[PDB]
Amino acid sequence: HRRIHFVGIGGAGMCGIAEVLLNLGYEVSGSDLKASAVTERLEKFGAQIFIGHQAENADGADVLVVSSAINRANPEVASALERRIPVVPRAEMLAELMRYRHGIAVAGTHGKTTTTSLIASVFAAGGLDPTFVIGGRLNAAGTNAQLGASRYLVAEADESDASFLHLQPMVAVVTNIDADHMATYGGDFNKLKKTFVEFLHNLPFYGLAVMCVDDPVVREILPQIARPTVTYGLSEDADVRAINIRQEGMRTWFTVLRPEREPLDVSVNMPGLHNVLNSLATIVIATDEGISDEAIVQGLSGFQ
Ligand SMILES: OC[C@H]1CCCCN1c1nc(Nc2cc(C3CC3)[nH]n2)c2c[nH]nc2n1
Numbered sequence: 001h002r003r004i005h006f007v008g009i010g011g012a013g014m015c016g017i018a019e020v021l022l023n024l025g026y027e028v029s030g031s032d033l034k035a036s037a038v039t040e041r042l043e044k045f046g047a048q049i050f051i052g053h054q055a056e057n058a059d060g061a062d063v064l065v066v067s068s069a070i071n072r073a074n075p076e077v078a079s080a081l082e083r084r085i086p087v088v089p090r091a092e093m094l095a096e097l098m099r100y101r102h103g104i105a106v107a108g109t110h111g112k113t114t115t116t117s118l119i120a121s122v123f124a125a126g127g128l129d130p131t132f133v134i135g136g137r138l139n140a141a142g143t144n145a146q147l148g149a150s151r152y153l154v155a156e157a158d159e160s161d162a163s164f165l166h167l168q169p170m171v172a173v174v175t176n177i178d179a180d181h182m183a184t185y186g187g188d189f190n191k192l193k194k195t196f197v198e199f200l201h202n203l204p205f206y207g208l209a210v211m212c213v214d215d216p217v218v219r220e221i222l223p224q225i226a227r228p229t230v231t232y233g234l235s236e237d238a239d240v241r242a243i244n245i246r247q248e249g250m251r252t253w254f255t256v257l258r259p260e261r262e263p264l265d266v267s268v269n270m271p272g273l274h275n276v277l278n279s280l281a282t283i284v285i286a287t288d289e290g291i292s293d294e295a296i297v298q299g300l301s302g303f304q
Contacts, residue, residue, distance in 0.1 A: 001062035004093075006030035007076050009049065010038045012067040014090060016138030020097050020131065020148030022046050031057045031076060045146055055079035065093045094136065094155075095163035101131075101153035104285060105167050107199060108175025108212070111278055112156040114270070115175060118282040119154045122299030126291040130154050157199070160184045165198055171288070172203055173210040173281050177217040193221055203227045210284045212277060213238050230288065232280040234273065240284045242276050251301075252276060256283050264293055268300050 004021055006014050009030025015038045018028045022045050029048040032039055039049045050057040055075040058064060064080045064087040072078055080087050098105070106116045113134050120132040124141050130152035131140045138147050157167055160181040177196055185191035200209050207227055213219045214233035222229065232240040245254040253267045254276055268279050279300055286296050 003027040003029065003060050003062050004065060005058050005061035005063070005076070005080075006065045007053070007074060008032055008067050009042065009047070010034070010036050012090065013094065013133075013136040013138060014065065014067050015039075015042060016133075016147050017065065017090065017093050017097065018042055018047055019045060019146055020138065023146045023148035024100055029057070029061065058085065061085055063088060065090055089162070091136065091161055092163045092166065094133065094138075095161075095166050097148065098153055098155060099168045101148070102151050103167070103169035104152065104154045104171045104173075105157040105169035106155065106173045106175070106281075107157035107159065107164075107196070108173065109159065109178035109180050111175040111274060112158070114275065115173060115278045115281050116154050116156050118268075118278050118300065118303060119285055121303045122282055122286045122291060122296055123150075123152055123154070123289075125299035125302070126286070126295035128152055128291075159192065159195060159199070164195070165202065167199070167202060169203065169207070171208045171210065171285055172200055173212075173285070174200070174215075174218055175212050175277065175281060176215040177221075193217060197221050197224050200225050200227060208285075208288055210281055212281065214277065230284050232284050233277065238280075240280055240287075242280055245273075245276060247271075254279075256280065258283070258287060261287070264296070266297055266300050269303060 004026055006018050010032040022028050031050040031053050035051055043049050053074055058076045058079050067090045070077050070087055106112050116132055116134055120130050123130045129142050130150045131147050133155035179189050209225050209227045209229045211218050211231050212233050213231040213235050231238045241257045242254045251267050251269050255263045255265050268275055
């Protein structure tokens with residue numbers, strides 16, 4: 001399959017996905033109700049854009065991406081269903097981008113968004129210009145460069161998303177495991193916890209699990225993770241720990257302890273121990289990746 005067609009390519013987090021797919025070398029087409037600077041950019045990058053929804057826009061497509069669900073009203077979808085051209089939801093195509101890059105999946109009920117951004121900020125300080133996914137929207141700092149150009153793809157992993165178990169990351173963080181989304185799993189918290197174990201088992205044997213052992217549920221499932229694991233937290237028995245936490249204004253300072261490394265003084269421009277924990281998770285990923293102490297310090301502190 002070589003040509004991907006987006007129904008409503010302008011809106012949502014549709015445009016970012018199309019942009020990455022162009023970067024990967026696919027033929028990309030899309031329809032939308034109104035032309036915009038978003039569709040002009042996609043067209044400049046090689047996408048074929050149709051204004052209006054007629055069945056002939058899906059011609060030649062090997063797969064359709066829709067933003068919400070399959071709508072019989074929209075004729076492109078119905079013309080695809082009738083040719084058995086698969087129609088996949090936006091979120092699933094978004095998840096699969098990770099198979100083409102060195103993916104870093106940030107899971108956890110709370111803190112996914114700040115941790116993803118901290119990671120992207122540090123990697124960017126290290127010259128790596130990652131593409132990152134927050135709220136289903138693809139971003140990077142390069143602006144002129146196509147999304148997906150970096151080797152690195154940093155993405156929120158939401159345990160209530162239907163594609164949660166279809167991510168193929170190289171690195172996975174679990175900041176914490178809460179019962180918010182029990183209804184997704186029959187309303188059973190034990191089922192929810194098993195899904196996080198399953199999610200971590202999507203790592204390859206050479207992958208990394210980054211686990212916040214300050215959360216008692218993360219700590220409970222730790223012995224089931226049969227994947228390389230680095231723990232972090234304020235707990236005294238974490239691999240990567242924060243000590244001597246202090247303040248200077250809205251800036252939080254602390255010293256991070258790492259195995260086989262000297263103590264490193266960092267600071268982050270956001271308050272509360274949760275942003276200390278977000279920094280530790282970032283520090284673990286950057287360290288394993290070989291990023292320098294200078295870029296870790298610069299990425300964490302210059303983060304607004
Ligand atoms: O159960 C401990 C959890 C439960 C509730 C939030 C505090 N806790 C936490 N948070 C993190 N990050 C966050 C959280 C938020 C906003 C929601 C406040 N922004 N960033 C974490 C990164 N690693 N570990 C974490 N723990």
